[PDB]
Nucleic acid binder design. Structure first.
Lengths: 199, 207
RNA sequence: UGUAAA
């Protein structure tokens, strides 16, 4: 069978991974309004924002869990961020993953990113995003591309102090846009096609 | 010699798919295809009996996509006013999923022409599991469910540039824009309404 | 899912 028809992915116990911390790494925007202001500034000058995010998966008791960065108590995001202009998507994601999650011991982590799982577009300088370019939207302000990041068997991660890292089970995310937004809450669907091996 | 350049990105990273105007396709009518069950009560009754003699039900469904003015539409079957379903149905025990789907596709939409109807089915887009003898299905196997009652598999069916389809007289055919499925999720159920999310990874060529 | 710990 083609990898196109069946895609097999190895998951490892959450306990295969040890998590340390590093110095805080704050977002470039300090508020929602600031975020859209900078989105506006840069659109004018570089064009559509290109964002990439990684979906790292571990299992617990043969159950897939997605790793999420928690900010405060009520906000969660996938590890990722903004591509520099002209930057390659996967190369850019590896860069961003190391920045946010890379161990500190000089041992450089090797990210395996071979799978695109989805795409979301932001038509305006506003919160709504859609898994398709909406009708007659010729100039989307942001394009967000999600990848499956296959974790090695064991790894060491370093979480900037300002974040917590959590492993959310799929049932927690499914049907829970009010808690995770439409992008994170539909990862269970986006991941369903994959043939997961537990270990 | 000459190097014939193919797509650089792996197929796992970039899946390119040709879509064609809905106007490229011819639609006709054929003999009605009645559902094997007469009522919800009958449905889960027959499902219970079969689980005992055949094991877990295995369903396959196909997602056929066309475009109108460069917006993707999924082809849906509508029964009466109240029910949308993807073309597909039940595998026989042991039947290959993809061969089964082609069988079912041909049966529900196949042209009664005498012309070869060939389906291109190279992509799995998702899996849904029914943990009890009840309607609810999940895009994952829930905790503590070792014996799901049904496994449903979704496939992307690539259409040729032109094709003829015959629709069973008792069904209507609908091309549903992705924004409809997404903006009005309640109307299509959890499987069809999350098709825009499941299709988003594809690089659709418009023609 | 948003800045109250962030």
């Amino acid at each position: 069978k083609p990898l196109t028809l069946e895609r097999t992915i190895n998951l490892y116990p959450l306990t295969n991974y040890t998590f340390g911390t590093k110095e805080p790494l704050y977002e470039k925007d300090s508020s929602v309004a600031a975020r859209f202001q900078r989105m506006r500034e840069e659109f004018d000058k570089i064009g559509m924002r290109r964002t990439v995010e990684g979906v790292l998966i571990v299992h617990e008791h043969r159950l897939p869990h997605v790793l999420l960065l928690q900010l405060g108590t009520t906000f969660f995001k996938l590890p990722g961020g903004e591509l520099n202009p002209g930057e390659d998507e996967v190369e850019g994601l590896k860069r961003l993953m190391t920045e946010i999650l890379g161990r500190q011991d000089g041992v450089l982590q090797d990210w395996v990113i071979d799978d695109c799982i989805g795409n979301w577009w932001r038509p305006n300088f506003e919160p709504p995003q859609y898994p398709y370019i909406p009708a007659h939207i010729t100039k989307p302000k942001e394009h967000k591309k999600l990848f499956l990041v296959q974790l090695q068997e064991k790894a060491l991660f370093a979480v900037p102090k300002n974040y917590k890292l959590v492993a959310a089970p799929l049932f927690e995310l499914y049907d829970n846009a009010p808690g995770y937004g439409p992008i994170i809450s539909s990862l269970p669907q986006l991941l369903s096609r994959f043939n997961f091996i537990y270990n």
